Write a protein that binds this ligand. Sequence first.
Ligand SMILES: [Cl-]
Ligand SMILES: [Cl-]
Ligand SMILES: [Cl-]
Ligand SMILES: [Cl-]
Lengths: 465, 465
Amino acid sequence: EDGIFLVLLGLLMALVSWSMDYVSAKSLQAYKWSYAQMQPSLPLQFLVWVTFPLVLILFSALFCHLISPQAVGSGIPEMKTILRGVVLKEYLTMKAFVAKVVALTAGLGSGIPVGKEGPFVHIASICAAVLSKFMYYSDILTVGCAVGVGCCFGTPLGGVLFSIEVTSTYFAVRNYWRGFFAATFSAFVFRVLAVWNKDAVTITALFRTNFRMDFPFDLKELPAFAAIGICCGLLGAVFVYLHRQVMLGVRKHKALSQFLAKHRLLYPGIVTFVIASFTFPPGMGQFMAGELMPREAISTLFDNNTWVKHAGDPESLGQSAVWIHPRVNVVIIIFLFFVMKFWMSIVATTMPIPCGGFMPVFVLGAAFGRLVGEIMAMLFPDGILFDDIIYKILPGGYAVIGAAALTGAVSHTVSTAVICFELTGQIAHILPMMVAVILANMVAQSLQPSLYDSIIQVKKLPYLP
Amino acid sequence: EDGIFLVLLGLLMALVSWSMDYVSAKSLQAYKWSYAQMQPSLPLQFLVWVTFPLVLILFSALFCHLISPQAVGSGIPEMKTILRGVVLKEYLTMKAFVAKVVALTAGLGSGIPVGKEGPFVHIASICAAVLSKFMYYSDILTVGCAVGVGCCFGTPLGGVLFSIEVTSTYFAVRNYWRGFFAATFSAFVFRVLAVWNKDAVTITALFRTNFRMDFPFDLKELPAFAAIGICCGLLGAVFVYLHRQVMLGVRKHKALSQFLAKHRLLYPGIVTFVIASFTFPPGMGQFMAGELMPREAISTLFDNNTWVKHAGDPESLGQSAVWIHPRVNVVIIIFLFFVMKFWMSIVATTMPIPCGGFMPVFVLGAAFGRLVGEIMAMLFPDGILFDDIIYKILPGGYAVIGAAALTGAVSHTVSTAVICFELTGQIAHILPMMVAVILANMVAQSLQPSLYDSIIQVKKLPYLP
Ligand SMILES: [Cl-]
Ligand SMILES: [Cl-]
Ligand SMILES: [Cl-]
Ligand SMILES: [Cl-]
């Protein structure tokens, strides 16, 4: 019967993931078009920029309130609690499935720092439970997690490895085989649908990069990759620390908690309003590449161009031209993007909506990575002679490493190295990604608990040692 | 103390692996040069072609006999037995380490189908045990296996995943973390040494390929990838079946066993002599690309050229020119290579030397893969129009899939998909590799037990259910 269960779980999740991306994309196109149509008047540009995401976030928060409060958050803290032996039954119901899928879709389409992966671990877990009931949570949820990550982005190995790291002491080998099968199948279907819908041509990586694959880096820049690893460790520790402090403040502050406890939806309202206010292009958005939606932030941060060099005509960068302000060195623009998004990301992940920190952190990591890359590009401008031609620093490589390393530091995982290279489609940098991730973890684990463990402690979940 | 143990295990194995490759390479250069120096006289070309490998194989077999009989074979059947709870103490001694490393090196340098990976799982396992004793076999050997594969080729994930599949029921998460760390570190050092010794320039994949990474295949050829998967399943089942029959025959036949039991070294002698006799270039080697040593068989089978099209001047193929006989379609040459090597590989893996079937099967798989690729290249010669240019079938992709799939079928593993793409350095074909491997396993597991399990049964090892 496993053949039926595993195929249907895999297939149905491929369809949920694909449909969600389809709709999310349409929301963002509607947003950009609507904004563009107001081009001659700043008050209307502001109105659109801000109200479009207020509507979607308030809808998301409200929908969960009305259908299933258990849909709020990333799921993973509760799934871990269940894997440890305490069955929080209320998080594996069809009501949560509906609330989660609907509200998440609305959230993603807003442009607000809301991840997708976290929620998919939960969505797949529920599906696995429901199919099983229709037709032993340690095995249901383990397969679920692998499928969730797999179908979320089209990243099979990422999923399987994740399903191991989320366990307690012992992992059953039988789940390795079941998870691997289902996650691979699901990912395959997901990418084929993209081709069918004229958005891929062949089966490809989700955020495919275009690095040289020929002398991709020298040994002389390995110290930079190592430095990114260590720095990501520290940044990750800070991210988690501050996240905790925000959650506790909102819940415990003597007066704030009285107010927000009654007037629900103020918190979503205000958080969203402020993030939108700062990102408006004519205001600070021009200094933060604020026109970029999460996927475009990734697409441009993993570019193969060297922004500090592309003078004369910035339009030659295509979409990446958004980073080249007429009066500000691109290094500063990257710095400001990182800093501003850092706190926006922390706060956004505390809103009462479906959300997660994987993709927010991934982007912050990429930004940090280019900051390092673009700076070295100004220090070693001459390049290296090999086989009669000159090879130069390729900052996109640093972005890829930074994304993996910071994610690692925040979650306490090494699976992120794999998810990241499956997303880019190129493995020129495997060994330095893996080393940077290990270093990031050694540092982060010595300072602060995983993001998920901080949440488990804060929410006082019945997590057995 | 784990920090010391894991670093030293990782480091020392990187040095054993690197040193072994260094020496193996020198033996092969000596072999080819010596052969070339006899160019005007066929009797001397024959003498060199054959006697060079007789000396090395007989040395290998003899050395193990004299130092440690327990060094013979692939180790893995015994390591699995130990992981199940029966401590075959005699296979984790320094005597085995010495016999194994010395005899293996000699074997690899002969050009005879002798793998490297199997033996490295064992070599690393012994090192892990010895360091531990110097300073709980389930944890010693699990880390050992990850390091073995890691340092063998420079393939971290391959190692970690392998260390899971070799276990019984439960895998300890703590070993995931220890193995991942050590295998990554070891692989890193291994590749850096290659750069230092002027054999890499940067850190690279071991057998780096050069595929387009742009429209790498169409959906219309996915049925071929699937067909390779299924066929590999069947071929794998046959390989294992025949391997078993040979082992049993040698041990049980009424008269043969009497003879060979006394006159040791006849079996190595005769097997080696025959494999050499058939591969001699002026004889059948010209119809089997017999000039190629294992690594060159891989390098040319994973080429980015289309051999059935490269008419006019075969020298434009460089090294791959060896496959283009003046009077024989390259498809036949590939076919004969596959068939002849298939039985040579089976028999070679029964000799009383350090050896294994991973790399032999890997090559057979690659050959089969191109056979499919090169044939389709003659059926769909027109190509596909995309972005104003024409894309055509790229058979090297089929070779990569075939290598992974056949290996999968023979061992009953999916980790081979990962080892394979880490070896090529390109992940354009991840999803079709993974699907082909899954299909190969579904077929093979329905027909015959893993190569290793057949051996465990044949040798009557005390393998608890
Ligand atoms: Cl969360
Ligand atoms: Cl996320
Ligand atoms: Cl063997
Ligand atoms: Cl091998």
